[PDB]
Design a protein around this ligand. Sequence first.
Ligand SMILES: NC(=O)c1ccc[n+]([C@@H]2O[C@H](COP(=O)([O-])OP(=O)(O)OC[C@H]3O[C@@H](n4cnc5c(N)ncnc54)[C@H](O)[C@@H]3O)[C@@H](O)[C@H]2O)c1
Ligand SMILES: NC(=O)c1ccc[n+]([C@@H]2O[C@H](COP(=O)([O-])OP(=O)(O)OC[C@H]3O[C@@H](n4cnc5c(N)ncnc54)[C@H](O)[C@@H]3O)[C@@H](O)[C@H]2O)c1
Ligand code: NA
Ligand code: NA
Ligand code: NA
Ligand code: NA
Ligand code: NA
Ligand code: NA
Ligand code: NA
Ligand code: NA
Ligand SMILES: [Zn+2]
Ligand SMILES: [Zn+2]
Ligand SMILES: [Zn+2]
Ligand SMILES: [Zn+2]
Lengths: 377, 377
Amino acid sequence: PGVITCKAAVVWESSGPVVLEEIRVDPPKASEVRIKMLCASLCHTDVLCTKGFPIPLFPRIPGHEGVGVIESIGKDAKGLKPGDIVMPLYLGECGQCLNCKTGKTNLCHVYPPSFSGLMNDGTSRMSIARTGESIYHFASCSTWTEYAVADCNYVLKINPKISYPHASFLSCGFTTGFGATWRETQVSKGSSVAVFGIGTVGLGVIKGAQLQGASKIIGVDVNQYKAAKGKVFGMTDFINPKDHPDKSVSELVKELTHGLGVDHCFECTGVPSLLNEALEASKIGIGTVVPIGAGGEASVAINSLILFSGRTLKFTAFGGVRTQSDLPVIIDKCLNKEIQLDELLTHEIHLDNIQEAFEILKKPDCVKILIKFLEHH
Amino acid sequence: PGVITCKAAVVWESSGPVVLEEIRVDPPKASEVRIKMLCASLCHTDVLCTKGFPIPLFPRIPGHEGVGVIESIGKDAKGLKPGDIVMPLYLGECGQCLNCKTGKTNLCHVYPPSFSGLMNDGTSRMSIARTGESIYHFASCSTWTEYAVADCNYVLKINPKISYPHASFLSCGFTTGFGATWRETQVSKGSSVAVFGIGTVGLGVIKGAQLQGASKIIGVDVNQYKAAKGKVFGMTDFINPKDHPDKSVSELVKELTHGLGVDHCFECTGVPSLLNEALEASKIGIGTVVPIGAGGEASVAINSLILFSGRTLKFTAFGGVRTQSDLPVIIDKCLNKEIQLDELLTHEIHLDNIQEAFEILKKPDCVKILIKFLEHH
Ligand SMILES: NC(=O)c1ccc[n+]([C@@H]2O[C@H](COP(=O)([O-])OP(=O)(O)OC[C@H]3O[C@@H](n4cnc5c(N)ncnc54)[C@H](O)[C@@H]3O)[C@@H](O)[C@H]2O)c1
Ligand SMILES: NC(=O)c1ccc[n+]([C@@H]2O[C@H](COP(=O)([O-])OP(=O)(O)OC[C@H]3O[C@@H](n4cnc5c(N)ncnc54)[C@H](O)[C@@H]3O)[C@@H](O)[C@H]2O)c1
Ligand code: NA
Ligand code: NA
Ligand code: NA
Ligand code: NA
Ligand code: NA
Ligand code: NA
Ligand code: NA
Ligand code: NA
Ligand SMILES: [Zn+2]
Ligand SMILES: [Zn+2]
Ligand SMILES: [Zn+2]
Ligand SMILES: [Zn+2]
């Protein structure tokens, strides 16, 4: 396989437009695979990338959520082959390092997250066709591009009868929330759960809590449209903070839990002040908070009195989901329809219309946006 | 028993002197006991009280650490009787509430910490003899006084052959650190531990970690005098941050742990910036931090990137030690000499010389100060 010429969405400067460019995609080197994208999606992490956060690397092809088919492989691709359906991964799972051997973490020492925007050898496989200028990728694999190249340890081969839109959603937020309910804290039968923020992450928490038999599942969101979505996934109670401007969120949760708070609180907004509220909403002595959302600031402040309260604060990436061990189990639940993801899909666009996605995500009835591709002939 | 006239150390205003006053101590009411103090001690929490933190309640008799003998009892004193040796408690253990039934917490719903400086009925048992002016107590029992009155649920009857100085030290810091090594995080055989701050709290952590079979126990302190004390209690490695002003504490710990950090880090200084360092010094994915020390500020800041690191942050009061279930076991280890506390005792004063304690605590060779009392005739 030679160099492929295709289209990709490129951002050239912080807060600049995302524009369609003709690019070249080099063939995969050793331990790489080249993927034809089947569909993609978008979350807040992609928006941050267009503003140069965390690292301003430009020009850049955004996108980390999606699914594709292997078009070609380098040497030593660990059994991957053309025609396999794969989803890109945030981090790998070597199964042999000190962290993998514990069974207690998904934070593999050997395949950790990357922030370089480049392949393992410090070069890019993607370049502007007109100039040859090198383009940074996003995370371990750009998905807003007709073709991408990834390290074989950062893709997961998946069952080919999973729907591609649903696999795209399981490559990030819903899986993060769903997995957190047994990998980061053990939601048990009869326990109480509160979920701050009812986007795809919070909907994953809600469904995970429901499948674990939580008997009270409180969703909190300022967007009233989210209440019906939460109910579909198992939410038992809804709080809109804007209905009570003189009450704190933790006060409102305690009102539903006999003044005690919940066993497990999941922070799925990223709003910095809501970390403190999540802690105050969980039970003294036996409550756990998992802060999934990110606020993008330098540090986050915790009321110093919470340090005496016996609560457990469990830090977390990708919901504690191990990407080779646990992620296939979640996909299988989707295949077997134990989880139903159709209600996540609210909007569809094609890649040429990528700029419209940044307006669509502001709409109150948006949950997940699907990005579709055209075929070359 | 009538009203007792005795001496007590009183602070009249924030940052004022601590002065000996003649006071009156009323007899115990229902569910109270009156105690003759045998000895007392001092920690930073008492210093804060003289500066009006957390609540400026004056006039006040400071002191929460000590041991005494019951002089008289109210009705319904739950089996306590004159002549019992008791230590005052920060919080009780009812054994029947939702939190007590879990076995997972010492934060009893029925006997929580008090901040009122007053008895359960909103009055004081202590007053200035010359005026009758009411005096606030400290915590659940003032100890810088020849006689005190406490709610019977906030004292623990102890074995009368325990040494009174050692029991005084076990009423607070050493017990907090020691208990944290199995109640808040489970230090296991062969694990690594780092301890920031080697006062009585950190020395308790070190000894608890040693008894649990931790194979590396790193003590961190800017006071070089503490290194020898740490070694007596089981410390294997010592770091003085001042020896490397261009390296962070977490960097120095990682240098001793193959770049990984420790399984369990205990923050025993209260220095706000050291909470972040404790987290960075613990292992990604599988490390736990217990922040025991208090900084007395409104909030504490955590580097936002730590929220992705898989670490566990376990909040805590009194080291997770349940005051009726776990505290007697710790006392018994002291009786059976499995823990040796003689090295804690560095300075002794009598109550009349209480003002000198605030200078003694600044001395680099101070660990614990014992406060002694005279008898009335
Ligand atoms: N862990 C991941 O994979 C991932 C991916 C993208 C973004 N994030 C961070 O995690 C959060 C959740 O991700 P998402 O895809 O589900 O985002 P989302 O935007 O779809 O959901 C966020 C929800 O929080 C609600 N919300 C915002 N502010 C609120 C407030 N002050 N009080 C109550 N509700 C509020 C919004 O209405 C929205 O429904 C994001 O807000 C962002 O901070 C995490
Ligand atoms: N949990 C409790 O029961 C309790 C009681 C009193 C005070 N406190 C808080 O907990 C801390 C520990 O209590 P303690 O009785 O053992 O206090 P302590 O003062 O006897 O010990 C604190 C030790 O930390 C060291 N230290 C201070 N700043 C440091 C720095 N920047 N880097 C490295 N070492 C530093 C000091 O040298 C000292 O050896 C106190 O500092 C205070 O914040 C807790
Ligand atoms: Na590679
Ligand atoms: Na396609
Ligand atoms: Na998002
Ligand atoms: Na996040
Ligand atoms: Na009482
Ligand atoms: Na005495
Ligand atoms: Na102290
Ligand atoms: Na403390
Ligand atoms: Zn995402
Ligand atoms: Zn690994
Ligand atoms: Zn103390
Ligand atoms: Zn109780």
